């Protein structure tokens, strides 16, 4: 029993986007469905719902007249057509299966991130935070939209790693740091590489961070 | 609309303690239609309790739900480390479907002072006309911390941004990054860069500084 969403990405305000949710492992046509969203750092908000047959749809006041929920039972797929998108529609969108009238949601998708912004897709610049236990890191600056991933030594280094939540700068671009604390004794012997991946711009960078000359 | 008010907004509790989470409805809700969800960062909500009192399959007995009318309760008898998460109530009794705003259950641990580090901008960044100065506060508890930036004894107000991690899965501490933004010209105009850190775990403020060059 699974729900797999897709279709998320970046769109400009006033824009349109269609999300899909592919259902497997159960009789899709038997179940009422819903979309639920969660703005970054905020709570769950119901968006829209549809009965099993697709004959009746339901909308939250925030999205009524802008969003259309639909399903294709012959394709085990649920849709959400989002039109006239606004900055406050930015969120992870989840599809959820109704279970019993529907009494609760029992199965959820993995979620798909929708960002609504006028800012253009841009890959990060990656700068070293050189070690002066020692701390070192990478500054991942000036990218858009979320998200970026950071690992160290291609995943081999996890102990003492802290990758901070991104902050939106006044410039409208995100920036974050990833740091690691390591034994002072290892500096200049052990190689430390931060692996940065900004999938929205297909930007990947491996940056060696070393003590400054 | 049925408004679900969850209280308290946040709980700080030690492993083995009882967690009592409340969900108050603005009007009566059939108990068959009131469910509780657990959510951890990066993950979809997980069904814990449906119909006010029934445990979902896989949910341990330490979770129990009760209540009726307008007052519902989720009790975790003895908190395990994996139980620290955010918890939402949901009603599907009437449209619009509504969620409570969530109760975040965080791990209480002993006071821990931050280890503070300061990082100059890299020469590479200076080539592009901007300077980022980073102050790291590592592995501290509780979350409350103040960072003050001074450049040649000038207090910096408004040109810095902060980011804080979630509690560490190993030690339940927080870390915080503060980034000061300056132009290269300004950076080169000044000598002494300092971040001053105030925290419960520190008897007096701790300052880390460097001299440019």
């Amino acid at each position: 029993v699974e729900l797999v969403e897709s279709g998320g990405g970046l769109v400009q305000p006033g824009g349109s986007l269609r999300l899909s949710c592919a259902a497997s492992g159960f009789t899709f046509s038997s179940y009422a469905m819903s979309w639920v969203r969660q703005a970054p750092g905020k709570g769950l908000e119901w968006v829209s719902a549809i009965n099993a047959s697709g004959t009746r749809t339901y909308y939250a006041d925030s999205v009524k007249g802008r969003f259309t929920i639909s399903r294709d039972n012959s394709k085990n797929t649920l849709y959400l057509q989002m039109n006239s998108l606004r900055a406050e529609d930015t969120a992870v969108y989840y599809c959820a299966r109704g279970k019993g009238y529907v009494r609760y949601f029992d199965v959820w998708g993995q979620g798909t991130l929708v960002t609504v912004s006028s800012a253009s897709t841009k890959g990060p610049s990656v700068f070293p935070l050189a070690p002066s236990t020692a701390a070192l890191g990478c500054l991942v600056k000036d990218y858009f939209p979320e998200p970026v991933t950071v690992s160290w030594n291609s995943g081999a280094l996890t102990s003492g790693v802290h990758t901070f939540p991104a902050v939106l700068q006044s410039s409208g671009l995100y920036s974050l740091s990833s740091v690691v604390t390591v034994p002072s004794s290892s500096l200049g012997t052990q190689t430390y590489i931060c692996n940065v991946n900004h999938k929205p711009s297909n930007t990947k960078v491996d940056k060696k961070v070393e003590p400054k000359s | 609309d049925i408004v679900l008010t969850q209280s308290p907004a946040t709980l700080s509790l030690s492993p083995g303690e009882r967690a009592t989470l409340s969900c108050r409805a603005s009007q009566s809700v059939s108990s068959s239609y009131l469910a509780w969800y657990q959510q951890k960062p990066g993950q979809a909500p997980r069904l814990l309790i449906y119909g006010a009192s029934s445990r979902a399959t896989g949910v341990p007995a330490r979770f129990s739900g009760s209540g009726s009318g307008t007052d519902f309760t989720l009790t975790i008898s003895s908190l395990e480390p994996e139980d620290f998460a955010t918890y939402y109530c949901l009603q599907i009794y009437n449209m619009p479907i509504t969620f409570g705003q969530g109760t975040k259950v965080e791990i209480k641990r002993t006071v821990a002072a931050p280890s503070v580090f300061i990082f100059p901008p890299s020469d590479e960044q200076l080539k592009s006309g901007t300077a980022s100065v980073v102050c790291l506060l590592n592995n501290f508890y509780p979350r409350e911390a103040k960072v003050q930036w001074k450049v040649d004894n000038a207090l910096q107000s408004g040109n810095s941004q902060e980011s804080v991690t979630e509690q560490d899965s190993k030690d339940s501490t927080y870390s915080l990054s503060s980034t000061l933004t300056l132009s290269k010209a300004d950076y080169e105009k000044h000598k002494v860069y300092a971040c001053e850190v105030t925290h419960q775990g520190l008897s007096s403020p701790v300052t880390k500084s460097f001299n440019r060059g």
Binding site: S30, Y31, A32, A49, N51, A52, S53, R56, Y58, Y59, K64, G98, K99, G100, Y101, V102 | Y33, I92, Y93, N94, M95, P96, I97
Partner: peptide, 11 residues
């Protein structure tokens, strides 16, 4: 599993 509870006319 099939329908949501609602007042008539809900949009």
């Amino acid at each position: 599993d099939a329908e949501f509870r609602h007042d008539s006319g809900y949009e």
